[PDB]
Design an enzyme around this catalytic site. Sequence first.
Site, short mmCIF file in Angstrom:
data_model
loop_
_atom_site.label_atom_id
_atom_site.label_comp_id
_atom_site.label_asym_id
_atom_site.label_seq_id
_atom_site.Cartn_x
_atom_site.Cartn_y
_atom_site.Cartn_z
N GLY A 1 0.77 -1.23 0.00
CA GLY A 1 0.00 0.00 0.00
C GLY A 1 0.81 1.28 0.00
O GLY A 1 0.33 2.32 -0.47
N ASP B 1 39.32 -37.76 -7.90
CA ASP B 1 40.55 -38.02 -8.62
C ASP B 1 41.22 -39.25 -8.04
O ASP B 1 41.13 -39.51 -6.84
CB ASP B 1 41.50 -36.82 -8.55
#
Lengths: 221, 608
Positions: free
Chosen positions: B14, B607
């Site tokens: 508002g 890895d």
Amino acid sequence: FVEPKWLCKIMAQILTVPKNYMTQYFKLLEKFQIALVPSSLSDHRPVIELPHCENSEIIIRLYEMPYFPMGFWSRLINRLLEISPYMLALRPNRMYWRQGIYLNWSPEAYCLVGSEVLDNHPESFLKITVPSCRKGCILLGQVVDHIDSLMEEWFPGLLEIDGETLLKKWALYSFNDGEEHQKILLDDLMKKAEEGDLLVNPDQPRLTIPISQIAPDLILA
Amino acid sequence: PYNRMKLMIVGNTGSGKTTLLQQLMKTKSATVGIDVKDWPIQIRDKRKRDLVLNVWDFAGREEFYSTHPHFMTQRALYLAVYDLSKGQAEVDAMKPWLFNIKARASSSPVILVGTHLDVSKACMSKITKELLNKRGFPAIRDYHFVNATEESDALAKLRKTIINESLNFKIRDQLVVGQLIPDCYVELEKIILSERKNVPIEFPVIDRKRLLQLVRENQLQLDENELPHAVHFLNESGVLLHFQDPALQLSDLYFVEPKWLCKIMAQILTVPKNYMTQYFKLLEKFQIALVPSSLSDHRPVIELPHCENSEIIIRLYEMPYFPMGFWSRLINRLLEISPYMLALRPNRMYWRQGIYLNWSPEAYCLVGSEVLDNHPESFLKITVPSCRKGCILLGQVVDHIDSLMEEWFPGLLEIDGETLLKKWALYSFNDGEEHQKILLDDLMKKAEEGDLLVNPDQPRLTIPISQIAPDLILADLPRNIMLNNDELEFEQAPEFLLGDGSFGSVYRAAYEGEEVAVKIFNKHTSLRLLRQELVVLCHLHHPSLISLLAAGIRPRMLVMELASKGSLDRLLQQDKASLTRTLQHRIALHVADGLRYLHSAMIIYRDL
Ligand SMILES: Nc1nc2c(ncn2[C@@H]2O[C@H](COP(=O)(O)OP(=O)(O)O)[C@@H](O)[C@H]2O)c(=O)[nH]1
């Protein structure tokens, strides 16, 4: 109690908000179903994702009536308060609201009573969900007996035969192999008259269901 | 130079935002979504730096608050409009927004704007100048009492202040408004802006193939490997939105004209057959799906099985307010991703501010906001049983919450030091019978790790820190693993006993009469990494993976079996003759079996 209007007014005083009789005060407060205040319990079902879906792992029973009687759910909640244990001990988890209880011991030993509204049906229902195991069957037996007792004790007019009887207890079975859905609903009295055998069978009799896994309070299970 | 910056117009419902915006851009209906635009400011000074702010007119209504923290970034200026009309209380009504600007974008300016000056109460500057200035709030840098719906000297000064305060941004002396970029980036932006016009209005989304076709059809020399960086930078500037995450199937679709995406996604909170599944995926990515908002906001009565202070473990989490989409992201994160065992689906009872997973009367977990008397702050009490499974659950829940805070709301952890987030731990010296659990800040208890007990002024009483905070002492894991420090014979300081050079900080020690290799994971970092590694290692149990022997907090250390012959690399270097055909085959077989077991557990050994 002489001059009863004073008793009634005083007892209803706390629903808008003598040091000797405090304990008697609380006792008759519970006797009027005022005590945990069973009214003002938020009226909103909380989302509950049960552990077991699958039509072959739960047992449903409905209870149809045009409206719930005035103090129905309060007396019912009070009656079901841990007085229905799976074993003959352990206190279960409990999640009350204004129209349900949901005692819950384990993922295979729970019990959820609670109003459930259906589409295109102005009537009211009291669906009871319970697991298919042994402890589940025990719980369903106790719950059905408690409800039936309450109806016969407080609201006799809901059982008076004229005959719709104003209270039609259903039992939800699913011939659909558990995978498929839309549990076919069968009035309980018809299955009681179907106690001659120990199975229910459709138009295609290749399918069958034992009446134990539908209504284990009728067959002694 | 890249002359482009985001202007964000925050506020409450508002209060004038779109009308203020219509009068700021001189561009003479409730907002739904965030209503992106952009206005170019042609500064007439000697430094005619033609800048383009792209505004984000945030909707004030509450139902959209779950999606707003996705569109609050650092490199942006903020407005905050607050409707002077209802003075002295509309200022105290926008403190949540300012706290949220603080949490999401901790170092972005804020220009308070008081609208509705026509009606009335301009002494709201009192509370603005006393309570709203520096007490845990995002660095307010100007405050105007402006009107909307008409231009005047007020709006003129407000507009000039936005310009000035924009140009002088300087995050760590950087001058955001005039930094440098590869010319290909601005070329890509211009071709995207042109593609905004030549695209169906009903669906403005573009395809990755269409983008590749567009960048190739013109002279843009951006390589294929360069496109992610460029498109992500244009994303940061609010030109186009995209989500390169592969967990979603959207990385082939690059949302151009983002205001349409935001409006469309917020459409369902008030109520292309190909992209239905992608629609649902990004609907969950915006936290819209079970709608986490509109969950009845009312705690349902829950009578837990276990009262008694010696049978439950409590932990609080204090903060001035819950951030905007906090509970939604948390509920989504805790969705069955925290099981007691390592299976069974638990009962779940959601509401707007809680979850309550419940397996058994001894394996439950209830997270949920709990408000206390005489305390305006907000709390996140977590209840859990004292058993082993309970300890496991508390560990997982605390890690999830802590991760969420560090990922989404960093400003709630920035040390100045109240820290805006004080994690308590409720202990009760009162023998469990009595009550009023004494609350002890968690960091103080962390510093009380020297011992393994807490003791009051009367030291006849004591409580083990396990039954208070089992995430600090390594008790949340299965298989209690502390190392019985009397039997360890470790010597850290000497490089004499390094497991070998360049193995990290792995040393050599003798535990229970056998030689072991002990990694010292102790550092300034918290128990996050150690507990992570211990969780991973605590359930692997394969003969081709290193076995876990113990773990200790004093100091942070891991105890594992000792491979006597060293790593394979040294054998390849030093004694090549030791390897024969049978040994080589056995090594390959054992490593292959290890990888097979890992993949059987859905784990990727990065890895090798
Ligand atoms: N008189 C006056 N009215 C205002 C002012 N600012 C806003 N309004 C009124 O407030 C409304 C603005 O609504 P808006 O801010 O766009 O709603 P929002 O998009 O949710 O923020 C309009 O109806 C305006 O008439 C002002 O400064 N003066």
